[PDB]
Design a protein around this ligand. Structure first.
Ligand SMILES: CC(=O)Nc1cccc2cc[nH]c12
Lengths: 235, 178
């Protein structure tokens, strides 16, 4: 994660992120909608950060420092490059939508009025098919990644010292190897919760309520497809 | 400090996400209550023992029977939640959640937690429930359910007022240690 986006998403809500003289200019309904939209982007930034810890810190760190058997690192971090591409692109579009909405003279005051169109695009067509295929693969390999990690930690001293070392900073407290895997698996089921609460506060413009209702139906169709395509792989 | 994993289970309207948020912040959020909970690792000292308690929610996974059990590996304690303002969420405990938690987590202690205990004294809650020939869950109904399913124990709390929240998590830590 980069300092620019970390600071834009440091506050606990949109009402605390913007200047109070800008907050005062908006209706409470707008603030409620914006707080949930801010939470969607903030958690998407954290999810992308989680995927960067898996690819750059864990996966690459193991390749450059350890002497693991070929295919072992892939079994510990399945589909992480594909996932990191899917979510960094989605995050880029969310951050660009916020940036275009900033007032001139401001790096923090914005109102996102149109999100549904962006959500329909991510959860339909080729991008939806790539998320369905990547999550069905990832979640089917989830158990094996955990078992393989536990096998290497208990039997390999060098793997144990590598893990203890790269996970020692306080910022990585809730981001160990097993934590990253479950954080990734659970991400897809957070979307309907976030979108339904945004929709609850987006009835002001009928076009937006319809776009968010379509987006919610698409995310649920994706989730049901991923759920049907899963079968745990055993080693 | 030993590492222990806690998973909270229960129906959508049981208040499990709010319980984890109020515990991890040590406060009921004054400006915004988050929609979701990612994870958290609590530093807890119970009965002289320091433990790192990783906290996990199952919210959003209630409809996905193949995705939901991926939250269960290596669990040390299960918090099984129901809402005191919802007697229908208590009825789902023995025939839906209990067989699932016993299959995927054999020999893991379950604490049955009655949430929203403040609503037992709410006039709007008592009025809305009476229209469907119902009333708030009584403490003996919660205890009898915990007994029937073979739970480690029965506890109540209010995430809204913070009453009983710290106690549930210190007890869960003790349960995970046995
Ligand atoms: C269902 C359940 O709670 N099983 C269980 C496992 C391990 C310890 C205890 C203590 C009471 N119950 C226990």
């Amino acid at each position: 994660s980069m300092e620019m986006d970390e600071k834009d998403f440091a506050a606990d809500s949109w009402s605390l992120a913007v200047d109070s003289s800008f907050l005062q200019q908006h209706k409470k309904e707008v603030m409620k909608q914006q707080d949930v939209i801010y939470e969607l982007i903030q958690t998407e930034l954290h999810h992308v950060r989680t995927l960067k810890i898996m690819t750059r810190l864990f996966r690459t760190g193991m390749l450059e420092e350890l002497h693991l058997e070929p295919g072992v690192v892939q079994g510990l971090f399945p589909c992480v490059d594909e996932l990191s591409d899917i979510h960094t692109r989605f995050l880029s579009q969310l951050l660009e939508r916020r940036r275009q909405a900033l007032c001139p003279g401001s790096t923090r005051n914005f109102v996102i009025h149109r999100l549904g169109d962006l959500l329909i695009s991510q959860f339909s067509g080729p991008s939806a098919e790539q998320m369905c295929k990547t999550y069905s693969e990832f979640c089917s390999r989830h158990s094996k990644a955990l078992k393989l990690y536990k096998e290497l930690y208990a039997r390999d001293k060098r793997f144990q010292q590598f893990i203890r070392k790269v996970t020692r900073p306080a910022v990585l407290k809730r981001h160990g190897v097993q934590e990253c895997i479950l954080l990734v698996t659970q991400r897809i089921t957070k979307y309907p919760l976030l979108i339904s609460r945004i929709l609850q506060h987006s009835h002001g413009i009928e076009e937006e309520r319809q776009d968010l209702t379509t987006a919610l139906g698409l995310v649920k169709e994706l989730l049901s497809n991923v759920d049907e395509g899963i079968y745990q792989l055993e080693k | 400090a030993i590492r222990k994993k806690l998973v909270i289970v229960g129906d959508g309207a049981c208040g499990k996400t709010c319980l984890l948020i109020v515990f991890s912040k040590d406060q009921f959020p004054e400006v915004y209550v988050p929609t979701v909970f990612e994870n958290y690792v609590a530093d807890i000292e119970v009965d002289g023992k320091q433990v790192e308690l990783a906290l996990w929610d199952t919210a959003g996974q209630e409809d996905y029977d193949r995705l939901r059990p991926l939250s269960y590996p290596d669990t040390d304690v299960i918090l099984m939640c129901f809402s005191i303002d919802s007697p229908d969420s208590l009825e789902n405990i023995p025939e839906k959640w209990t067989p699932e938690v016993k299959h995927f987590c054999p020999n893991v202690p379950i604490i049955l937690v009655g949430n929203k205990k403040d609503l037992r004294n709410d006039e709007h809650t008592r009025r809305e429930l009476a229209k469907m020939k119902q009333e708030p869950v009584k403490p003996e109904e919660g205890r009898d359910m915990a007994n029937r399913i073979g739970a480690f124990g029965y506890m109540e709390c209010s995430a809204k007022t913070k009453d009983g929240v710290r106690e549930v998590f210190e007890m869960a830590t003790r349960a995970a240690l046995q």
